[PDB]
Amino acid sequence: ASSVNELENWSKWMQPIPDSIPLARISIPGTHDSGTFKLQNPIKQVWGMTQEYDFRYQMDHGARIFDIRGRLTDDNTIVLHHGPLYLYVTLHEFINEAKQFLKDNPSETIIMSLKKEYEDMKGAEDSFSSTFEKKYFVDPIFLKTEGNIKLGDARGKIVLLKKYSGSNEPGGYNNFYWPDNETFTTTVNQNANVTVQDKYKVSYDEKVKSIKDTMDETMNNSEDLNHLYINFTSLSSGGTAWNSPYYYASYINPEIANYIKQKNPARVGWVIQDYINEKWSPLLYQEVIRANKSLI
């Protein structure tokens, strides 16, 4: 769509973008541990909570990537989890939330990250991957094509990003290595590379350094559509005494948001944040989106 003023529309920002751009090339803002908005317990909050608004407010703000972590239950279903805590949100709840958003804004698509946060219940029936692929993934809204996932194809459905081995059905982004805590780089499909910066449990100093550092590389490697760039602005720690994911989001988002503003980059990659709202000075998600002007 000829205009640039389209990126300003958070619910349909992927409309002006050509149906020929690989999802990897697009600077898509994400959300970290998305299903934690319901946490109301004060002690569970300063540790678990990384969000404050439901999946609709989330994607109604430009967010197109969701960090979904779950567990297999007795009732042969998948519920959202955070470590050994049941977050009072379910997997159906999410897919149902995205279908509604997509029926309303057909121009958009959404990448659903999925991992086995906890161990299958002591009385389940099938495996984790099987249960998901036989009871959920087997839905039409789930893009079944793979390769270098272009926008023209994912429009209207849910692009699945595997973060679990044991997958038997084709579709989405093939689950790769992904080391615990670090900035790594590995091959995805047969035609792709990934540079994931997931340095959780680190100092504020190193954290913001590592973000900007990876954001530097992508900003310069803004022409290789064969490279996926994940950037977790999220930072966790001892909570309670101002070590919570909230304390860090309040500085890191506006800070990293500015970094994008001044740099006038073309590409900033997939930026998975914490506490996506409208109270932090420049707003990270709005900046990530705007940086797609170079694509229109």
CSV table of all heavy atoms in Angstrom, one decimal, residues 18-62:
chain,number,residue,atom,x,y,z
A,18,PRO,N,4.8,-5.7,1.1
A,18,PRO,CA,4.7,-6.6,0.0
A,18,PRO,C,4.6,-8.0,0.3
A,18,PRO,O,5.3,-8.5,1.2
A,18,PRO,CB,6.0,-6.3,-0.8
A,18,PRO,CG,6.2,-4.8,-0.5
A,18,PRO,CD,6.0,-4.8,0.9
A,19,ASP,N,3.7,-8.7,-0.4
A,19,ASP,CA,3.4,-10.2,-0.1
A,19,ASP,C,4.5,-11.0,-0.7
A,19,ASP,O,4.3,-12.1,-1.2
A,19,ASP,CB,2.1,-10.6,-0.8
A,19,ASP,CG,0.9,-9.9,-0.2
A,19,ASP,OD1,0.4,-10.4,0.8
A,19,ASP,OD2,0.5,-8.8,-0.7
A,20,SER,N,5.8,-10.5,-0.6
A,20,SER,CA,6.9,-11.2,-1.1
A,20,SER,C,8.1,-11.0,-0.2
A,20,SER,O,9.3,-11.3,-0.6
A,20,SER,CB,7.2,-10.7,-2.5
A,20,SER,OG,6.1,-10.5,-3.3
A,21,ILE,N,7.9,-10.6,1.0
A,21,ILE,CA,9.0,-10.4,2.0
A,21,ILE,C,9.0,-11.6,2.9
A,21,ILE,O,7.9,-12.0,3.4
A,21,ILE,CB,8.8,-9.1,2.8
A,21,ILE,CG1,8.5,-7.9,1.8
A,21,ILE,CG2,10.0,-8.8,3.7
A,21,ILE,CD1,9.5,-7.8,0.7
A,22,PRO,N,10.2,-12.2,3.1
A,22,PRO,CA,10.2,-13.3,4.0
A,22,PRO,C,10.0,-12.8,5.4
A,22,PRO,O,10.5,-11.7,5.8
A,22,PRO,CB,11.7,-13.8,3.9
A,22,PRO,CG,12.1,-13.3,2.6
A,22,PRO,CD,11.5,-11.9,2.5
A,23,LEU,N,9.2,-13.5,6.2
A,23,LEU,CA,8.9,-13.1,7.6
A,23,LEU,C,10.1,-12.7,8.3
A,23,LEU,O,10.1,-11.8,9.2
A,23,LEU,CB,8.2,-14.2,8.3
A,23,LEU,CG,6.6,-14.2,8.1
A,23,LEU,CD1,6.0,-15.2,9.1
A,23,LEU,CD2,6.1,-12.8,8.3
A,24,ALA,N,11.3,-13.3,8.0
A,24,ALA,CA,12.5,-13.1,8.6
A,24,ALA,C,13.1,-11.7,8.4
A,24,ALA,O,13.7,-11.1,9.3
A,24,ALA,CB,13.6,-14.1,8.1
A,25,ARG,N,12.8,-11.1,7.2
A,25,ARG,CA,13.3,-9.8,6.8
A,25,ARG,C,12.5,-8.7,7.5
A,25,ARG,O,13.1,-7.6,7.9
A,25,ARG,CB,13.2,-9.6,5.3
A,25,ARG,CG,14.3,-8.8,4.7
A,25,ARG,CD,14.0,-7.4,4.4
A,25,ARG,NE,14.0,-6.6,5.7
A,25,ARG,CZ,14.5,-5.3,5.8
A,25,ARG,NH1,15.0,-4.7,4.7
A,25,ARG,NH2,14.4,-4.7,6.9
A,26,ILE,N,11.2,-8.9,7.8
A,26,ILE,CA,10.4,-8.0,8.4
A,26,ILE,C,10.8,-7.8,9.9
A,26,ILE,O,11.1,-8.8,10.6
A,26,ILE,CB,8.9,-8.4,8.4
A,26,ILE,CG1,8.5,-8.7,6.9
A,26,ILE,CG2,8.0,-7.3,9.0
A,26,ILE,CD1,7.1,-9.3,6.8
A,27,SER,N,10.7,-6.6,10.4
A,27,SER,CA,11.1,-6.3,11.7
A,27,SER,C,9.7,-6.4,12.5
A,27,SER,O,8.9,-5.5,12.5
A,27,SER,CB,11.6,-4.8,11.9
A,27,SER,OG,12.9,-4.7,11.3
A,28,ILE,N,9.5,-7.6,13.1
A,28,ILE,CA,8.3,-7.8,13.8
A,28,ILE,C,8.5,-7.8,15.3
A,28,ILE,O,9.4,-8.4,15.8
A,28,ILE,CB,7.7,-9.2,13.4
A,28,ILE,CG1,8.2,-9.6,12.0
A,28,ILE,CG2,6.2,-9.2,13.5
A,28,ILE,CD1,7.7,-11.0,11.6
A,29,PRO,N,7.7,-7.0,16.0
A,29,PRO,CA,7.8,-6.9,17.5
A,29,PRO,C,7.1,-8.1,18.1
A,29,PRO,O,6.0,-8.5,17.6
A,29,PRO,CB,7.1,-5.6,17.8
A,29,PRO,CG,6.1,-5.5,16.8
A,29,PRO,CD,6.8,-5.9,15.5
A,30,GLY,N,7.7,-8.7,19.1
A,30,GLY,CA,7.1,-9.9,19.8
A,30,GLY,C,6.7,-9.6,21.2
A,30,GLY,O,6.6,-8.4,21.6
A,31,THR,N,6.4,-10.6,22.0
A,31,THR,CA,6.1,-10.5,23.4
A,31,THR,C,6.6,-11.7,24.1
A,31,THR,O,6.5,-12.9,23.6
A,31,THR,CB,4.5,-10.4,23.6
A,31,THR,OG1,3.9,-11.5,22.9
A,31,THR,CG2,4.0,-9.1,23.1
A,32,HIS,N,7.3,-11.5,25.2
A,32,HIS,CA,7.9,-12.6,26.0
A,32,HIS,C,7.1,-13.2,27.1
A,32,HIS,O,6.6,-12.5,28.0
A,32,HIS,CB,9.3,-12.0,26.5
A,32,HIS,CG,10.0,-13.0,27.5
A,32,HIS,ND1,9.8,-12.9,28.8
A,32,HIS,CD2,10.9,-13.9,27.3
A,32,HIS,CE1,10.6,-13.8,29.4
A,32,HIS,NE2,11.2,-14.4,28.5
A,33,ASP,N,6.9,-14.5,27.1
A,33,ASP,CA,6.1,-15.3,28.1
A,33,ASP,C,4.7,-14.6,28.1
A,33,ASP,O,4.2,-14.4,29.2
A,33,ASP,CB,6.8,-15.2,29.4
A,33,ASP,CG,6.6,-16.5,30.2
A,33,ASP,OD1,5.7,-17.3,29.9
A,33,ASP,OD2,7.3,-16.7,31.2
A,34,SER,N,4.2,-14.4,27.0
A,34,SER,CA,2.9,-13.8,26.8
A,34,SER,C,1.7,-14.1,27.7
A,34,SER,O,1.0,-13.2,28.1
A,34,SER,CB,2.4,-13.9,25.4
A,34,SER,OG,3.4,-13.6,24.5
A,35,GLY,N,1.5,-15.4,28.1
A,35,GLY,CA,0.4,-15.8,28.9
A,35,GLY,C,0.6,-15.6,30.4
A,35,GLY,O,0.0,-16.3,31.2
A,36,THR,N,1.2,-14.5,30.8
A,36,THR,CA,1.4,-14.2,32.3
A,36,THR,C,0.6,-13.0,32.7
A,36,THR,O,0.7,-12.6,33.9
A,36,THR,CB,2.9,-14.0,32.6
A,36,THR,OG1,3.4,-13.0,31.7
A,36,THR,CG2,3.7,-15.3,32.4
A,37,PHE,N,-0.3,-12.4,31.9
A,37,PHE,CA,-1.1,-11.3,32.2
A,37,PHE,C,-2.1,-11.5,33.4
A,37,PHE,O,-2.5,-10.5,34.0
A,37,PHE,CB,-1.8,-10.7,31.0
A,37,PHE,CG,-2.6,-11.8,30.3
A,37,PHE,CD1,-3.9,-12.0,30.7
A,37,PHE,CD2,-2.2,-12.4,29.2
A,37,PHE,CE1,-4.7,-12.9,30.1
A,37,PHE,CE2,-3.0,-13.4,28.5
A,37,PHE,CZ,-4.3,-13.6,29.0
A,38,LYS,N,-2.5,-12.7,33.6
A,38,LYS,CA,-3.5,-13.1,34.6
A,38,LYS,C,-2.9,-13.2,36.1
A,38,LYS,O,-3.7,-13.2,37.0
A,38,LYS,CB,-4.3,-14.3,34.3
A,38,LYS,CG,-5.4,-14.1,33.3
A,38,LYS,CD,-5.9,-15.5,32.8
A,38,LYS,CE,-7.2,-15.3,32.0
A,38,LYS,NZ,-7.0,-15.5,30.6
A,39,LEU,N,-1.6,-13.3,36.2
A,39,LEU,CA,-1.0,-13.4,37.5
A,39,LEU,C,-1.4,-12.2,38.4
A,39,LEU,O,-1.1,-11.1,38.1
A,39,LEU,CB,0.6,-13.5,37.4
A,39,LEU,CG,1.1,-14.8,37.0
A,39,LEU,CD1,2.6,-14.7,36.7
A,39,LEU,CD2,0.8,-15.9,38.0
A,40,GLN,N,-2.0,-12.6,39.5
A,40,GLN,CA,-2.5,-11.6,40.5
A,40,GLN,C,-1.9,-11.7,41.9
A,40,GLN,O,-1.9,-10.8,42.7
A,40,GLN,CB,-4.0,-11.7,40.6
A,40,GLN,CG,-4.8,-10.4,40.8
A,40,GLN,CD,-6.2,-10.5,40.3
A,40,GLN,OE1,-6.5,-10.0,39.2
A,40,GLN,NE2,-7.1,-11.0,41.1
A,41,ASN,N,-1.2,-12.9,42.1
A,41,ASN,CA,-0.5,-13.1,43.4
A,41,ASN,C,0.8,-12.3,43.5
A,41,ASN,O,1.7,-12.6,42.7
A,41,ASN,CB,-0.2,-14.6,43.5
A,41,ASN,CG,-1.5,-15.5,43.3
A,41,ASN,OD1,-2.1,-15.5,42.3
A,41,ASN,ND2,-1.8,-16.3,44.4
A,42,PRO,N,0.8,-11.4,44.4
A,42,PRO,CA,1.9,-10.5,44.7
A,42,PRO,C,3.3,-11.1,44.7
A,42,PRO,O,4.3,-10.5,44.1
A,42,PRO,CB,1.6,-9.9,46.0
A,42,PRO,CG,0.1,-9.8,45.9
A,42,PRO,CD,-0.3,-11.1,45.3
A,43,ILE,N,3.4,-12.3,45.3
A,43,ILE,CA,4.7,-13.0,45.3
A,43,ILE,C,5.0,-13.7,43.9
A,43,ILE,O,6.2,-13.8,43.5
A,43,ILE,CB,4.8,-14.0,46.4
A,43,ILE,CG1,4.9,-13.3,47.8
A,43,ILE,CG2,5.9,-15.0,46.3
A,43,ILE,CD1,6.2,-12.5,48.0
A,44,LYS,N,3.9,-14.1,43.3
A,44,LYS,CA,4.1,-14.8,42.0
A,44,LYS,C,4.3,-13.7,40.9
A,44,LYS,O,4.9,-14.1,39.8
A,44,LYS,CB,2.8,-15.6,41.7
A,44,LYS,CG,2.8,-16.9,42.5
A,44,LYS,CD,1.4,-17.4,42.7
A,44,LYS,CE,0.6,-17.7,41.3
A,44,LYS,NZ,-0.8,-18.1,41.5
A,45,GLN,N,3.9,-12.5,41.1
A,45,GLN,CA,4.1,-11.4,40.2
A,45,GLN,C,5.5,-10.9,40.0
A,45,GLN,O,6.0,-10.9,38.9
A,45,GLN,CB,3.2,-10.2,40.6
A,45,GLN,CG,1.7,-10.5,40.4
A,45,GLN,CD,0.8,-9.2,40.6
A,45,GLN,OE1,0.1,-8.8,39.7
A,45,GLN,NE2,0.9,-8.6,41.8
A,46,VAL,N,6.2,-10.6,41.1
A,46,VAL,CA,7.5,-10.1,41.1
A,46,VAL,C,8.5,-11.2,40.6
A,46,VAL,O,9.8,-10.9,40.5
A,46,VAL,CB,8.0,-9.6,42.4
A,46,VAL,CG1,7.2,-8.3,42.8
A,46,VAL,CG2,7.9,-10.6,43.5
A,47,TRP,N,8.0,-12.3,40.2
A,47,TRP,CA,8.9,-13.4,39.7
A,47,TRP,C,8.4,-13.9,38.3
A,47,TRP,O,9.2,-14.0,37.4
A,47,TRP,CB,8.8,-14.6,40.7
A,47,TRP,CG,9.5,-14.4,42.0
A,47,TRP,CD1,9.1,-13.7,43.0
A,47,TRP,CD2,10.8,-14.9,42.3
A,47,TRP,NE1,10.0,-13.7,44.1
A,47,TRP,CE2,11.1,-14.4,43.6
A,47,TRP,CE3,11.8,-15.7,41.7
A,47,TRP,CZ2,12.3,-14.7,44.3
A,47,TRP,CZ3,13.0,-16.0,42.3
A,47,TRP,CH2,13.2,-15.5,43.7
A,48,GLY,N,7.1,-14.2,38.2
A,48,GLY,CA,6.6,-14.7,37.0
A,48,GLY,C,6.1,-13.7,35.9
A,48,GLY,O,6.5,-13.8,34.8
A,49,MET,N,5.2,-12.8,36.3
A,49,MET,CA,4.6,-11.8,35.4
A,49,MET,C,5.6,-11.0,34.5
A,49,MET,O,6.5,-10.3,35.0
A,49,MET,CB,3.7,-10.9,36.2
A,49,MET,CG,2.5,-10.5,35.3
A,49,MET,SD,1.7,-8.9,35.8
A,49,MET,CE,0.0,-9.4,36.0
A,50,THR,N,5.3,-11.1,33.2
A,50,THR,CA,6.1,-10.3,32.2
A,50,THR,C,5.2,-9.6,31.3
A,50,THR,O,5.6,-9.0,30.3
A,50,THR,CB,6.9,-11.3,31.4
A,50,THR,OG1,6.1,-12.2,30.7
A,50,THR,CG2,7.9,-12.1,32.2
A,51,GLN,N,3.9,-9.6,31.7
A,51,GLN,CA,2.8,-8.9,30.9
A,51,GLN,C,1.7,-8.4,31.8
A,51,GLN,O,1.6,-8.9,32.9
A,51,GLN,CB,2.3,-9.9,29.8
A,51,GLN,CG,3.2,-10.3,28.7
A,51,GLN,CD,3.6,-9.1,27.9
A,51,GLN,OE1,2.9,-8.1,27.8
A,51,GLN,NE2,4.7,-9.2,27.2
A,52,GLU,N,0.9,-7.5,31.3
A,52,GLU,CA,-0.2,-7.0,32.0
A,52,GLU,C,-1.5,-6.9,31.2
A,52,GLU,O,-2.6,-6.6,31.8
A,52,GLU,CB,0.2,-5.6,32.6
A,52,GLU,CG,0.7,-4.6,31.5
A,52,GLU,CD,1.1,-3.3,32.1
A,52,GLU,OE1,1.0,-3.1,33.4
A,52,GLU,OE2,1.6,-2.4,31.4
A,53,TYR,N,-1.5,-7.2,29.9
A,53,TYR,CA,-2.6,-7.1,29.1
A,53,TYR,C,-2.7,-8.4,28.2
A,53,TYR,O,-1.8,-8.8,27.6
A,53,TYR,CB,-2.5,-5.9,28.2
A,53,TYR,CG,-2.5,-4.6,28.9
A,53,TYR,CD1,-1.5,-3.6,28.7
A,53,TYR,CD2,-3.5,-4.2,29.8
A,53,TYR,CE1,-1.5,-2.4,29.3
A,53,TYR,CE2,-3.5,-3.0,30.4
A,53,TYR,CZ,-2.5,-2.1,30.2
A,53,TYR,OH,-2.5,-0.8,30.8
A,54,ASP,N,-3.9,-8.9,28.1
A,54,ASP,CA,-4.3,-10.1,27.4
A,54,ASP,C,-3.8,-10.1,25.9
A,54,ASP,O,-3.5,-9.1,25.4
A,54,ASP,CB,-5.8,-10.3,27.4
A,54,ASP,CG,-6.6,-9.2,26.8
A,54,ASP,OD1,-6.7,-8.1,27.5
A,54,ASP,OD2,-7.1,-9.4,25.7
A,55,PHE,N,-3.8,-11.3,25.3
A,55,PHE,CA,-3.4,-11.5,23.9
A,55,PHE,C,-4.1,-10.6,22.9
A,55,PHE,O,-3.5,-10.4,21.8
A,55,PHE,CB,-3.8,-13.0,23.5
A,55,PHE,CG,-3.0,-14.0,24.2
A,55,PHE,CD1,-3.7,-15.2,24.6
A,55,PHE,CD2,-1.7,-13.9,24.5
A,55,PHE,CE1,-3.0,-16.2,25.3
A,55,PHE,CE2,-1.0,-14.9,25.2
A,55,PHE,CZ,-1.6,-16.0,25.6
A,56,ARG,N,-5.2,-10.0,23.2
A,56,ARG,CA,-5.8,-9.1,22.2
A,56,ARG,C,-5.2,-7.8,22.3
A,56,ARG,O,-4.8,-7.2,21.3
A,56,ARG,CB,-7.4,-9.0,22.4
A,56,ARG,CG,-8.0,-8.3,21.3
A,56,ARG,CD,-7.6,-8.8,19.9
A,56,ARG,NE,-8.0,-8.0,18.8
A,56,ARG,CZ,-9.1,-8.2,18.0
A,56,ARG,NH1,-9.9,-9.2,18.3
A,56,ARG,NH2,-9.4,-7.4,17.1
A,57,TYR,N,-5.1,-7.2,23.5
A,57,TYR,CA,-4.4,-5.9,23.7
A,57,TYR,C,-3.0,-6.1,23.1
A,57,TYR,O,-2.5,-5.2,22.4
A,57,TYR,CB,-4.3,-5.6,25.1
A,57,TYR,CG,-3.6,-4.2,25.5
A,57,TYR,CD1,-4.3,-3.2,26.0
A,57,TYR,CD2,-2.2,-4.1,25.3
A,57,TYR,CE1,-3.6,-2.0,26.3
A,57,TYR,CE2,-1.5,-2.9,25.6
A,57,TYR,CZ,-2.3,-1.9,26.1
A,57,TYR,OH,-1.6,-0.7,26.5
A,58,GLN,N,-2.4,-7.2,23.3
A,58,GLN,CA,-1.0,-7.5,22.8
A,58,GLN,C,-0.8,-7.4,21.3
A,58,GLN,O,0.0,-6.6,20.9
A,58,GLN,CB,-0.6,-8.9,23.3
A,58,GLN,CG,-0.4,-9.0,24.8
A,58,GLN,CD,0.3,-10.2,25.3
A,58,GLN,OE1,0.9,-10.9,24.5
A,58,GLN,NE2,0.2,-10.5,26.6
A,59,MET,N,-1.7,-8.1,20.6
A,59,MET,CA,-1.6,-8.0,19.1
A,59,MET,C,-2.3,-6.8,18.5
A,59,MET,O,-2.0,-6.4,17.3
A,59,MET,CB,-2.1,-9.3,18.4
A,59,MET,CG,-3.4,-9.8,18.9
A,59,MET,SD,-3.7,-11.4,18.2
A,59,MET,CE,-3.5,-12.6,19.6
A,60,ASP,N,-3.1,-6.1,19.3
A,60,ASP,CA,-3.8,-4.9,18.9
A,60,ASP,C,-2.8,-3.8,19.1
A,60,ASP,O,-3.2,-2.6,19.0
A,60,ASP,CB,-5.0,-4.7,19.8
A,60,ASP,CG,-6.4,-5.0,19.1
A,60,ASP,OD1,-6.4,-4.9,17.8
A,60,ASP,OD2,-7.3,-5.2,19.8
A,61,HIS,N,-1.6,-4.1,19.4
A,61,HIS,CA,-0.5,-3.2,19.6
A,61,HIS,C,0.7,-3.4,18.6
A,61,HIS,O,1.8,-2.9,18.9
A,61,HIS,CB,0.0,-3.2,21.0
A,61,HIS,CG,-0.9,-2.3,21.9
A,61,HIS,ND1,-2.2,-2.4,22.0
A,61,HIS,CD2,-0.5,-1.3,22.7
A,61,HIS,CE1,-2.7,-1.5,22.8
A,61,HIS,NE2,-1.7,-0.8,23.3
A,62,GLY,N,0.4,-4.2,17.6
A,62,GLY,CA,1.5,-4.5,16.6
A,62,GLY,C,2.2,-5.8,16.9
A,62,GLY,O,2.8,-6.3,15.9
